[PDB]
């Protein structure tokens, strides 16, 4: 582990210090279909004419990014994503920009969002959930060792690849920070009490989010849900959680430790770091090495009717890609 991380960090820093840029053009691709939508732009299934390969191209309207004051978070996303490298992290193939947009070409993960499958099937069996959880556990061990904080873990941001494994996508709020940060961001249901209470936080919020995910995958619904966000935050800070009667005793224990309001006693944030999690009973049958290597059998394998298939994604209205004849927000995105 420690040996591994050490090398991973040296590779990350080389790219972190000298990120790549303008490694493609819009015309080197064929726009096929919208795979999802965001606030600054849509993610489109695209085809690299030269290689004939399929990619998920994330488009960001520079002006909208500026209106929402997401400039730094956006630069954070491209800078971090172009430098990391882990099995369960979607890879950024190319990145470029034009008069009005920023582009990030990622690998296309046909399997679809965990969200879709999870909502449809209702809930995952504990073993099934343990499978995905294990992957998130290692992915965070990786990310955090790089001084990175993901800040937006949720079913919507996890894709299932052809082998049935997880691919974390969307680093919109990822940040490289040693020490503590204060930005209020993330998704309501998954927010740590610290964030909601504007007290300054760290990686610990990623572990609390892990608890929320595991609970949602196991129960079929979040540990804290309501109709209005404010009602949700009230539930979160109350340090009161209810578990489905079917949750195993081990599972409930692991969750009581993750959804720990007291940063002094929250798994992942103790002297034993992540090991307090890896060595937890609920993960007894989990062979961590076997997971990182993708040797373990995937409990679910989304199949596709061929390359370019988008049957695992919802349908969105198709918006044309317009590019002003005038450069927009040039100085703000110079390093992109």
């Amino acid at each position: 582990v420690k040996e591994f991380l050490a090398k991973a960090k040296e590779d990350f820093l080389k790219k972190w210090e000298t990120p790549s840029q303008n490694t493609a053009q819009l015309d080197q691709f064929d726009r096929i279909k919208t795979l999802g939508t965001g606030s600054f732009g849509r993610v489109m299934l695209v085809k690299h004419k030269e290689s004939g390969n399929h990619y998920a191209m994330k488009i960001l309207d520079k002006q909208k990014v500026v209106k929402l004051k997401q400039i730094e978070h956006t630069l954070n996303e491209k800078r971090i994503l172009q430098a990391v490298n882990f099995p369960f992290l979607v890879k950024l193939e190319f990145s470029f920009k034009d008069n009005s947009n920023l582009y990030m070409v990622m690998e296309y993960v046909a399997g679809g969002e965990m969200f879709s499958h999870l909502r449809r099937i209702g809930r995952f069996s504990e073993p099934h959930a343990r499978f995905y959880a294990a992957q998130i556990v290692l992915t965070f061990e990786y990310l955090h060792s790089l001084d990175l904080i993901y800040r937006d873990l949720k079913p919507e941001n996890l894709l299932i690849d052809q082998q049935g494994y997880i691919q974390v996508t969307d680093f919109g709020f990822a940040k490289r920070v040693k020490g503590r940060t204060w930005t209020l961001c993330g998704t309501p249901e998954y927010l740590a009490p610290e964030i909601i209470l504007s007290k300054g936080y760290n990686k610990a919020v990623d572990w609390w989010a892990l608890g929320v995910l595991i609970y949602e995958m196991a129960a079929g619904y979040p540990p804290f849900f309501a109709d209005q966000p404010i009602q949700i935050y009230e539930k979160i800070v109350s340090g009161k959680v209810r578990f489905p009667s079917h949750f195993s005793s081990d599972l409930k224990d692991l969750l009581r430790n993750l959804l720990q309001v007291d940063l002094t006693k929250r798994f992942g944030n103790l002297k034993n770091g992540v090991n307090d999690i890896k060595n937890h009973k609920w993960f007894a049958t989990t062979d961590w090495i076997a997971i990182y290597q993708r040797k373990v059998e995937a409990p679910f394998i989304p199949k596709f009717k061929g390359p370019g298939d988008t049957s695992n994604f919802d349908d969105y209205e198709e918006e044309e890609i317009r590019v002003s004849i005038n450069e927009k927000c040039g100085k703000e995105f110079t390093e992109f």
Binding site: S39, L68, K69, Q70, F115, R119, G122, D152, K154, E156, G172, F173, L184, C185, G186, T187, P188, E189, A219, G220, Y221, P222, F225, A226, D227, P229, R242, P244
Partner: peptide, 20 residues
């Protein structure tokens, strides 16, 4: 049931992030 309440809630669809 908890499940029922969730399914009848308005937050079963894709949830957006909060910038602010």
């Amino acid at each position: 049931t908890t499940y029922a309440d969730f399914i009848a809630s308005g937050r079963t669809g894709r949830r957006n992030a909060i910038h602010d």
